[PDB]
Amino acid sequence: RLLRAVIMGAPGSGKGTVSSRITTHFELKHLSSGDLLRDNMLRGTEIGVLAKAFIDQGKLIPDDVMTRLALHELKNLTQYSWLLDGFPRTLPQAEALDRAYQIDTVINLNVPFEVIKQRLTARWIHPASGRVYNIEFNPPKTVGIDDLTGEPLIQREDDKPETVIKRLKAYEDQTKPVLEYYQKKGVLETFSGTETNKIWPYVYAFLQTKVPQR
Ligand SMILES: Nc1ncnc2c1ncn2[C@@H]1O[C@H](COP(=O)(O)OP(=O)(O)OP(=O)(O)OP(=O)(O)OP(=O)(O)OC[C@H]2O[C@@H](n3cnc4c(N)ncnc43)[C@H](O)[C@@H]2O)[C@@H](O)[C@H]1O
Ligand SMILES: [Cl-]
Ligand SMILES: [Cl-]
Ligand SMILES: [Mg+2]
Ligand code: NA
C-alpha cells in the first residue's frame, strides 16, 4: 500500500526540517507546493508566469490555479509513495484533493504560538556590514548593538513582530479549517512539542509503520 500523506505546520514550526528528514529516511517522493511553484516560475511555464504575478504582489495563488498545478504533478507520482507539503493550504484545496485521491495520513506539528513567534522575530542585522545576529543562537555582546562598531542593530520588515503576528494569524485562518476537516475524516495525527529534535523521533516511529525506509 503506497503512502498517501500530507504534512502540516505553521511557519517556524520545524515542518521544513521534519519534511527534509522524512525524505532522507523513507522511500517516498516529497511534493512541496513552494518548490513546484518556484520550478515553474524559473522555467517560465504558463502557470509559472501566472504564479509569479501573484507572488510578486504578496498574494496567495488562487485555489483553482494551485489545485490544477498540484494535481498535474501528482499524476506523475502515482506509482510512488508521496508526501504533500504546503498543499492543501485552504479548505477548498483540501476538498478538491479529496475528490481526486484518497489521503490516508495527515501529520500536524503542534508548536505553541509564542514559540513560533519568538523564532520568527529573532533575527537582527547591522545594516552597513550585513552582520547577522539571532537573539536565540548568536546574540550580540550588548543588547541591540553591533559587536564591532557599537552601532544600532535593526530588524528587516519581514522579521518584525507586527508583520509576524499578521502572518501567523493568516496561516491559522487558512489552515485551522483544514486541520478540522482531516480530524473529522479520522486521518489526523498530531505531534506536540517545542523543540524539533524532540518531536522528530515520534514522527519517525509513526511513519515506520506506514512506508519502507530507504
Ligand atoms: N498551497 C498553496 N496555495 C496557495 N498559495 C501557495 C500555496 N503554496 C505556496 N503558495 C504561495 O507560494 C509561496 C511559496 O512559499 P512557501 O511554500 O510558503 O515557502 P517554503 O520555503 O517552501 O516553506 P518550508 O516548508 O520549506 O519552510 P522553511 O524550512 O523555509 O522554514 P520557515 O519559513 O517556516 O521558518 C523560518 C524561521 O523558523 C525558524 N526555524 C525553522 N525551523 C526551526 C527549527 N527546527 N527549530 C528552531 N527554529 C526553526 C528559523 O530559525 C527561521 O527564523 C507562498 O508564500 C504562497 O504565496
Ligand atoms: Cl518551519
Ligand atoms: Cl537568523
Ligand atoms: Mg522545504
Ligand atoms: Na557571535
Technique employed here was X-ray
Cα 120 to averaged position of ligand 5 atoms, centre (Å): 19
For a substitution probing ligand 1, which of 20, 36, 61, 93 has the most ligand atoms within 8 Å of its CB? 61
- Residue 141 half-sphere exposure, CB side, CA atoms within 13 Å? 6
Residue 125 cell numbers, joined: 542585522
Do the beta carbons of residue 83 and residue 3 sit within 8 Å? yes
Segments making up each domain of the chain, as ranges: 1-214
Q: Which residue has the cell 489521503?
A: 103
Question: Bridge partners of 124?
Answer: 133
Residue 171 cell numbers, joined: 496561516
Query: Which stretch of DSSP H or E encloses residue 191?
Result: strand 188-192
To the question of whether residue 131 is assigned a binding role by annotation, the answer is no
Do the beta carbons of residue 178 and residue 90 sit within 8 Å? yes
Q: Is the peptide bond before 88 cis (omega within 30 degrees of 0)?
A: yes
Q: Entry resolution in angstroms?
A: 1.5
Hey, what amino acid is at 138?
N
Do the beta carbons of residue 7 and residue 85 sit within 8 Å? yes
Other C-beta atoms closer than 10 Å to the C-beta of 101 total 13
Other C-beta atoms closer than 10 Å to the C-beta of 5 total 23
Residue 169 cell numbers, joined: 494569524
Do the beta carbons of residue 104 and residue 52 sit within 8 Å? no
| 187 phi/psi in degrees, rounded to 5 | -115, 0
How buried is 176 (Cβ within 10 angstroms: 0-12 exposed, 13-18 middle, 19+ buried)? exposed
| 2 phi/psi in degrees, rounded to 5 | -70, 140
Q: What is the spatial order of strands in the sheet that 82-85 belongs to? A: 29-32, 82-85, 4-8, 105-110, 188-192
Q: Check pocket membership of 139 for ligand 1, CB cut-off 6 A.
A: no
State the Cα–Cα distance between residues 41 and 50, nearest whole angstrom: 9
Instruction: Using CA atoms of 96, 99, 103, 108 in order, give the dihedral in degrees to the nearest 10.
Output: 20
Instruction: Using CA atoms of 114, 119, 122, 125 in order, give the dihedral in degrees to the nearest 10.
Output: -150
In order of 49, 113, 116, 190, 197, the CA distances from 193 in angstroms are 39, 11, 11, 10, 9
State the Cα–Cα distance between residues 127 and 151, nearest whole angstrom: 9
| 48 phi/psi in degrees, rounded to 5 | -70, -40
Enumerate the active-site residues.
15, 89, 123, 156, 167
Residues near 166 by beta carbon (within 8 Å), at least 6 away in sequence:
none
- Cα 83 to the center of its chain, rounded Å: 12
Residue 116 cell numbers, joined: 513560533
Long-range contacts of the stretch 152-156 (C-beta < 8 A, 24+): 153/124, 153/125, 153/126, 154/124, 154/125, 154/127, 155/121, 155/123, 155/124, 155/125, 156/123, 156/125
